[PDB]
Design a protein around this motif. Structure first.
Motif, PDB file in Angstrom:
ATOM      1  N   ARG D   8     130.271  81.706 -51.514  1.00  0.00           N
ATOM      2  CA  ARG D   8     130.749  81.190 -52.789  1.00  0.00           C
ATOM      3  C   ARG D   8     130.525  79.684 -52.888  1.00  0.00           C
ATOM      4  N   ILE D   9     130.354  79.206 -54.115  1.00  0.00           N
ATOM      5  CA  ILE D   9     130.128  77.788 -54.364  1.00  0.00           C
ATOM      6  C   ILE D   9     131.350  77.211 -55.064  1.00  0.00           C
ATOM      7  CG2 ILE D   9     127.620  77.773 -54.330  1.00  0.00           C
ATOM      8  CD1 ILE D   9     127.572  78.349 -57.221  1.00  0.00           C
ATOM      9  N   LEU D  10     131.653  75.953 -54.758  1.00  0.00           N
ATOM     10  CA  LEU D  10     132.856  75.294 -55.239  1.00  0.00           C
ATOM     11  C   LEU D  10     132.496  74.118 -56.134  1.00  0.00           C
ATOM     12  CD1 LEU D  10     134.635  75.147 -51.789  1.00  0.00           C
ATOM     13  CD2 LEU D  10     134.929  76.906 -53.532  1.00  0.00           C
ATOM     14  N   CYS D  11     133.228  73.989 -57.238  1.00  0.00           N
ATOM     15  CA  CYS D  11     133.132  72.845 -58.128  1.00  0.00           C
ATOM     16  C   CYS D  11     134.536  72.357 -58.453  1.00  0.00           C
ATOM     17  CB  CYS D  11     132.381  73.194 -59.416  1.00  0.00           C
ATOM     18  SG  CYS D  11     132.940  74.707 -60.229  1.00  0.00           S
ATOM     19  N   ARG D  12     134.668  71.045 -58.634  1.00  0.00           N
ATOM     20  CA  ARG D  12     135.961  70.405 -58.860  1.00  0.00           C
ATOM     21  C   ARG D  12     135.963  69.759 -60.238  1.00  0.00           C
ATOM     22  N   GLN D  13     136.753  70.316 -61.155  1.00  0.00           N
ATOM     23  CA  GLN D  13     136.883  69.785 -62.510  1.00  0.00           C
ATOM     24  C   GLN D  13     138.227  69.076 -62.597  1.00  0.00           C
ATOM     25  N   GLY D  14     138.232  67.795 -62.255  1.00  0.00           N
ATOM     26  CA  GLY D  14     139.443  67.005 -62.271  1.00  0.00           C
ATOM     27  C   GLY D  14     140.172  67.024 -60.938  1.00  0.00           C
ATOM     28  N   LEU D  15     140.975  65.982 -60.722  1.00  0.00           N
ATOM     29  CA  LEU D  15     141.729  65.805 -59.487  1.00  0.00           C
ATOM     30  C   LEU D  15     143.213  66.113 -59.671  1.00  0.00           C
ATOM     31  CD1 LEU D  15     140.148  62.618 -57.843  1.00  0.00           C
ATOM     32  CD2 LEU D  15     139.937  65.006 -57.126  1.00  0.00           C
ATOM     33  N   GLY D  16     143.534  67.092 -60.515  1.00  0.00           N
ATOM     34  CA  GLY D  16     144.932  67.401 -60.763  1.00  0.00           C
ATOM     35  C   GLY D  16     145.633  67.992 -59.555  1.00  0.00           C
ATOM     36  N   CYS D  17     145.002  68.958 -58.896  1.00  0.00           N
ATOM     37  CA  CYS D  17     145.621  69.645 -57.771  1.00  0.00           C
ATOM     38  C   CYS D  17     144.885  69.431 -56.460  1.00  0.00           C
ATOM     39  CB  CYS D  17     145.723  71.149 -58.074  1.00  0.00           C
ATOM     40  SG  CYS D  17     144.132  72.004 -58.170  1.00  0.00           S
ATOM     41  N   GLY D  25     139.788  80.188 -48.197  1.00  0.00           N
ATOM     42  CA  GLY D  25     140.802  79.160 -48.073  1.00  0.00           C
ATOM     43  C   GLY D  25     140.393  77.997 -47.194  1.00  0.00           C
ATOM     44  N   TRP D  26     139.268  77.367 -47.516  1.00  0.00           N
ATOM     45  CA  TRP D  26     138.765  76.236 -46.754  1.00  0.00           C
ATOM     46  C   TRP D  26     138.372  75.114 -47.704  1.00  0.00           C
ATOM     47  CZ3 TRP D  26     138.729  77.126 -41.410  1.00  0.00           C
ATOM     48  CH2 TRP D  26     138.373  76.018 -40.634  1.00  0.00           C
ATOM     49  N   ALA D  27     138.474  73.880 -47.215  1.00  0.00           N
ATOM     50  CA  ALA D  27     138.200  72.700 -48.020  1.00  0.00           C
ATOM     51  C   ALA D  27     137.187  71.809 -47.317  1.00  0.00           C
ATOM     52  CB  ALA D  27     139.483  71.908 -48.298  1.00  0.00           C
ATOM     53  N   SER D  28     136.229  71.306 -48.088  1.00  0.00           N
ATOM     54  CA  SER D  28     135.250  70.353 -47.590  1.00  0.00           C
ATOM     55  C   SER D  28     134.883  69.414 -48.724  1.00  0.00           C
ATOM     56  CB  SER D  28     134.002  71.051 -47.042  1.00  0.00           C
ATOM     57  N   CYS D  29     134.387  68.237 -48.367  1.00  0.00           N
ATOM     58  CA  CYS D  29     133.991  67.288 -49.391  1.00  0.00           C
ATOM     59  C   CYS D  29     132.573  67.580 -49.859  1.00  0.00           C
ATOM     60  CB  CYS D  29     134.088  65.852 -48.880  1.00  0.00           C
ATOM     61  SG  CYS D  29     132.613  65.255 -48.048  1.00  0.00           S
ATOM     62  N   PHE D  30     132.321  67.283 -51.128  1.00  0.00           N
ATOM     63  CA  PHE D  30     130.992  67.464 -51.682  1.00  0.00           C
ATOM     64  C   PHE D  30     130.037  66.354 -51.275  1.00  0.00           C
ATOM     65  N   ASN D  31     130.555  65.223 -50.796  1.00  0.00           N
ATOM     66  CA  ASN D  31     129.701  64.067 -50.553  1.00  0.00           C
ATOM     67  C   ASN D  31     128.856  64.252 -49.297  1.00  0.00           C
ATOM     68  N   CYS D  32     129.491  64.424 -48.139  1.00  0.00           N
ATOM     69  CA  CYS D  32     128.742  64.541 -46.898  1.00  0.00           C
ATOM     70  C   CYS D  32     128.886  65.934 -46.297  1.00  0.00           C
ATOM     71  CB  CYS D  32     129.186  63.492 -45.872  1.00  0.00           C
ATOM     72  SG  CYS D  32     130.766  63.816 -45.051  1.00  0.00           S
ATOM     73  N   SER D  33     127.899  66.299 -45.478  1.00  0.00           N
ATOM     74  CA  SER D  33     127.880  67.587 -44.792  1.00  0.00           C
ATOM     75  C   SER D  33     128.801  67.502 -43.586  1.00  0.00           C
ATOM     76  CB  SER D  33     126.460  67.957 -44.380  1.00  0.00           C
ATOM     77  N   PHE D  34     129.984  68.069 -43.719  1.00  0.00           N
ATOM     78  CA  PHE D  34     130.963  68.124 -42.646  1.00  0.00           C
ATOM     79  C   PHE D  34     131.935  69.249 -42.982  1.00  0.00           C
ATOM     80  CE2 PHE D  34     134.888  66.166 -40.648  1.00  0.00           C
ATOM     81  CZ  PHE D  34     134.574  66.616 -39.385  1.00  0.00           C
TER      82      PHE D  34
END
Ligand SMILES: [Zn+2]
Ligand SMILES: [Zn+2]
Ligand SMILES: [Zn+2]
Ligand SMILES: [Zn+2]
Ligand SMILES: [Zn+2]
Ligand SMILES: [Zn+2]
Ligand SMILES: [Zn+2]
Ligand SMILES: [Zn+2]
Lengths: 64, 497, 194, 179, 80, 79
Positions: D8-17, D25-34
């Protein structure tokens, strides 16, 4: 009735008296009522001034 | 010997019979899925379904009877989770627009929990699996569906509470059902649905508190965790603060009278109670404001309000000299009780205004009423609906208002009921407008620039004054909106650091 | 009057409480009894009216909440036992006429520490324990039926009235010996007794 | 892209939550590969740390603190397992315990990263975060002490726990937005 | 004719030394009766049972329920 | 006529600011400041028309002398 029974119990023990809980046990045994009922009678008697609380040993109660 | 045997025998078997085949289905999943469908009609003792259900029950209990994390319990728990998730997904897709969504949802929760207790006995891990399954089923849904679901939940809670308060004989049944049904709604904690659900709960609880309490705290005692920003409790705290303020005001009046008597000697009334609300945790539409009090109120009432406002101003004085100052904007909300003839009537503030107008006049024109009102006439018609009913002593005929001729000794409680709001492409336009304003503001400052919170202050001020110098374009922004838009702009490389 | 005179300060409220207490103590026993009975009746009558009635009810109910803080002065005195005895006797009938609503739990979460032995809380908890027992009875029925199906399957391999039961501890409810059933089959229909 | 895995691919529309993957149930930043999500430290700072090498899942004291934080996270996981493995508890206690476990885990993770961090004034943020997390930890420990099931059925202090959890949530949101 | 749609029935669960250590109710504590030279006073609790302060001190230090009625033990402080 | 027996009026209270968040401590401005929050917390604003906690800005000024938002000198604008 509870008042007079407790008065007799306190008089029998004399200047030794008892810790209050022991006295409750004695009266409950002599009944054959709730512990709280006996405590209520005790408090009313204390307010009447017949009995006092031992200042040195607050655990036990002293008749006077 | 036991441990060796049991491990080597059962654990591969469950690891092999709980794996999802490429279609997306496993074996024990299929069996448990069949369990509920057959249990729908598995009550007759002489039927194939009875034997089928008994066999499945015995199998599952024998499988799980070894546990005292675990080796095989993980897989069976995940199978239960998958089954529950699929069931809830299917049902939710089925009837998410029905007029009876929430009772069916609660009943489904009850059926699934009882089935789990029957299949595996009393255990906590399976309850955790059930909750996770319901959560996961809720998540994989489009936004508008989630918004509608939250609105329906809030409307249900409000309807049950209001019915319990007004309905006498069956109200006890409604309240018992409400306490039973509260448990499924707790699933919303830990989702964005909490954020979208707090909003509608706020809107409905405002009207409930104004029109009528003590059951609201009881409900909040068990639905408390669901609300992220905790605004509903803040409302009740505000009510308590208002009561304290009234007591202080009385003491201040007595002190002032004492000072006046000292200075001098140095040689049948309406009962008004005032309620003050905070703007942090109270939704009030600026269309509901009252601007000119003397324009639409008698003189004694205005005097009382003016003296209370003076008390508030003088009480806002001490270290608070440095800092902003507080004010009072009066609103059309509230309740009032009148005693007319034999009967006692209960109305709202606007209805009290309309009624007291008839004190020395026999007819008023709706046009004149709305002209002097300076309020949006949709509100006027909403407040006139209960007035023009049978109990209401007023009728508007083409129209002009006129009295209802007499025709006993019973209180008449007439107040508009809550008008529930329904969720129906505004967000796109709002984002575009905020972004364009932002880019203009940041284009104005060259390389001098501004701080992040400085840019926030400028955009917030602009939107407070409004991009309207209009109504087609222009809602109130928040810092979250500013941060989101600047995130989009940063992603477009238009801003650097 | 105290607040207007001496300002808001702590010790004067405690003085007011102790004064009320001492006054209630300087009384005869019959009169203490009558007063306690009047308090119990007031609570029962307010709850009855608020639940049964409509808007007059919700009016009376906020008042009911106001008036509790005077009552709560009774704690720690002798009158507590007689007040609790009288309260049990109305809470019984109220619970049997209506399920344990929010009202009884809220009133108790206000004035609970007044009751010396905590009898009312135990009645309330009893209703909940009984619902749990109903769940367990359902499961037990299922297990029995499973054993029957298994035995018969090895030998082969070889429109109704709903009823709910409620158990009450006699250490907490005042159930008179006059209120009993002795020959249950004789006085009741057949399926019910089954 | 989602990194654990799943496709699955993730997109972030706003920083509300703030978002994790809906499926796993995993989180990673879009900026760098980590794979993980690094709130306090920039992608460059994390890259420098990993190229120089550090603990994972003055300078010596840093490593010590990071190990302590990850160990506390392990303790929270162990508590969740132990409660989950009981042979049904009251609803409010169960939901609060699950919420408290999730909150403590996330807070300890982000606090470990904030330790890994090194006109910056984030020190007060990390300080009161440590204070609140330790307070909630002590409360849970006090409610932990012989038979676990009876202890949970017993329990009030639940209100204090709710307050502390809200505090942790607000502060975590503050750190995420400010960063 | 009438028909029953629901119903509720009622029944009672009809059925004394220091049960926890089994010594006589008014007698002394067996734990300290082994170590002769008797200091345990009796303790009362809201749930209306009487046990030895020694017994209860230990037991409570172990577990936090009344061993006789499955309720959180509360040291009775009325009348005191 | 029509006689009133009781009335309940409702009012809100209004600022002159639109901040809704203190920058120094990142908490909602109407709530208490961080230090007061851990264990009489008033808001103050400058001629720069920036609002902050009294305690937040007090600590910041014990540290520095420039307003943290505008690179200017501070004025405890009074009334
Ligand atoms: Zn994923
Ligand atoms: Zn990165
Ligand atoms: Zn013993
Ligand atoms: Zn002993
Ligand atoms: Zn006991
Ligand atoms: Zn601040
Ligand atoms: Zn402060
Ligand atoms: Zn400034």
């Amino acid at each position: 009735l509870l008042s007079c029974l407790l008065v007799r119990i306190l008089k029998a023990h004399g200047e030794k008296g008892l810790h209050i809980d022991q006295l409750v046990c004695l009266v409950l045994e002599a009944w054959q009522c709730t512990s709280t009922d006996v405590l209520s009678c005790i408090l009313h008697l204390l307010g009447q001034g017949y009995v006092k609380r031992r200042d040195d040993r607050p655990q036990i109660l002293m008749y006077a | 010997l036991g441990k060796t045997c049991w491990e080597a025998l059962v654990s591969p078997l469950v690891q092999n019979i709980t794996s999802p085949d490429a279609e997306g289905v496993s074996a024990l999943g299929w069996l448990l899925d069949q369990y509920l469908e057959q249990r729908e009609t598995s009550r007759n003792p002489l039927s194939r379904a009875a034997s089928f259900a008994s066999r499945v029950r015995r199998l599952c209990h024998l499988l799980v009877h070894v546990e005292p994390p675990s080796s095989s319990l993980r897989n069976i728990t995940q199978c239960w989770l998958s089954v529950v998730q699929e069931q809830v997904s299917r049902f939710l897709a089925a009837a998410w627009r029905a007029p009876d969504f929430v009772p069916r949802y609660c009943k489904l929760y009850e059926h699934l929990q009882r089935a789990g207790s029957e299949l595996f006995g009393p255990r906590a891990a399976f309850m955790l699996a059930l909750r996770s399954g319901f959560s996961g089923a809720l998540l994989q849904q489009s936004f508008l569906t989630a918004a509608h679901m939250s609105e329906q939940f809030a409307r249900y809670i409000d309807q049950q509470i209001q019915g319990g308060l007004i309905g006498g004989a069956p109200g006890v049944e409604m309240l018992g059902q409400l306490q039973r049904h509260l448990e499924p709604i707790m699933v919303l904690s830990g989702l964005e649905l909490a954020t979208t659900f707090e909003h509608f709960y706020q809107h409905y609880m405002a009207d409930r508190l104004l029109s009528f309490s003590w059951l609201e705290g009881a409900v909040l005692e068990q639905i408390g965790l669901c609300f992220p920003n905790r605004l509903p409790q803040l409302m009740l705290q505000s009510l308590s603060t208002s009561e304290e303020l009234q007591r202080q005001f009385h003491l201040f009046q007595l002190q002032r009278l004492d000072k006046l008597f000292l200075e001098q000697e140095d040689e049948p009334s309406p009962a008004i109670s005032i309620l003050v609300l905070s703007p942090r945790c109270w939704p009030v539409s600026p269309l509901c404001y009252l601007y000119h009090p003397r324009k639409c109120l008698p003189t004694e009432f205005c005097d009382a309000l003016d003296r209370f406002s003076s008390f508030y101003s003088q009480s806002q004085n001490h270290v608070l000299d440095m800092g902003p100052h507080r004010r009072l904007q009066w609103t059309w909300l509230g309740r009032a009780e009148l005693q007319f003839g034999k009967q006692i009537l209960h109305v709202s503030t606007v209805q009290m205004w309309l009624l007291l107008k008839f004190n020395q006049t026999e007819e008023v024109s709706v046009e004149t009423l709305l002209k002097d009102s300076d309020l949006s006439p949709e509100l006027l018609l909403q407040a006139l609906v209960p007035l023009t009913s049978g109990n209401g002593p007023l009728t508007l005929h083409e129209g002009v208002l006129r009295l209802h001729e007499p025709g006993s000794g019973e209180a008449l409680w007439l107040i508009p009921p809550q008008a529930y709001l329904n969720v129906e492409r505004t967000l796109e336009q709002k984002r575009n407008l905020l972004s364009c304003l932002l880019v203009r503001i940041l284009k104005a400052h060259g390389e001098k620039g501004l701080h992040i919170d400085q840019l926030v202050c400028l955009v917030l001020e602009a939107w407070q004054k409004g991009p309207n110098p209009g109504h087609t374009v222009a809602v109130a922004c928040t810092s979250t909106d500013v941060l989101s838009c600047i995130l989009h702009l940063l992603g477009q490389g238009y801003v650097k650091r | 009057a105290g607040s207007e005179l001496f300002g808001p300060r702590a010790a004067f409220m405690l003085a007011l409480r102790s004064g009320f207490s001492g006054a209630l103590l300087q009384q005869s026993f019959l009169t203490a009894a009558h007063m306690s009975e009047q308090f119990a009746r007031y609570i029962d009558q307010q709850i009855q009216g608020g639940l049964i009635g409509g808007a007059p009810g919700v009016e009376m109910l906020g008042q009911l909440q106001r008036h509790l803080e005077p009552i709560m002065v009774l704690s720690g005195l002798e009158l507590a036992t007689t007040f609790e005895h009288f309260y049990q006797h109305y809470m019984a009938d109220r619970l049997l006429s209506f399920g344990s609503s929010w009202l009884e739990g809220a009133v108790l979460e206000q004035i609970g520490l007044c009751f010396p032995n905590r009898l009312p809380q135990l009645m309330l908890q009893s209703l909940s324990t009984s619902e749990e027992l109903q769940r367990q009875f359902h499961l037990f029925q299922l297990q029995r039926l499973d054993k029957l199906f298994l035995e018969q399957e090895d030998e082969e391999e070889k429109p109704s009235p709903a009823i709910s039961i409620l158990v009450l501890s006699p250490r907490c409810w005042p159930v008179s010996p006059l209120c009993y059933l002795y020959h249950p089959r004789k006085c009741l229909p057949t399926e019910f007794c089954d | 892209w989602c990194t654990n895995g799943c496709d699955r691919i993730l997109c972030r529309q706003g920083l509300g939550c703030g978002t994790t993957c809906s499926k796993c149930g995993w989180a990673s930043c879009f900026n760098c590969s980590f794979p993980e999500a690094h709130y306090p430290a920039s992608c460059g700072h994390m890259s420098q740390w990993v190229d120089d090498g550090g603990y994972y899942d003055r300078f010596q004291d840093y490593n010590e603190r990071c190990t302590f934080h990850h160990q506390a996270r392990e303790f929270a996981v162990n508590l969740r397992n132990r409660v989950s493995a009981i042979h049904v508890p009251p609803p409010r206690s169960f939901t609060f315990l699950n919420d408290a476990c999730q909150g403590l885990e996330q807070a300890r993770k982000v606090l470990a990263y904030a330790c890994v961090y090194s006109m910056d004034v984030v020190e007060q943020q990390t300080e009161n975060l440590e204070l609140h997390t330790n307070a909630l930890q002590i409360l849970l420990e006090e409610t932990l002490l012989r038979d676990l099931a009876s202890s949970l059925r017993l329990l009030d202090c639940l209100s204090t726990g709710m307050e502390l959890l809200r505090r942790i949530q607000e502060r975590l949101l503050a750190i995420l937005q400010h960063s | 004719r009438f028909e029953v749609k629901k119903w509720n029935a009622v029944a009672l669960w009809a059925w004394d030394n220091c049960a926890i250590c089994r010594n006589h109710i008014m007698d002394l504590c067996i734990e300290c009766q082994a170590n002769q030279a008797e200091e345990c006073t009796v303790a009362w609790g809201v749930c209306n049972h009487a046990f030895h302060f020694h017994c209860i001190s230990r037991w409570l230090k172990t577990r936090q329920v009344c061993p006789l009625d499955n309720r959180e033990w509360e040291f009775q402080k009325y009348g005191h």
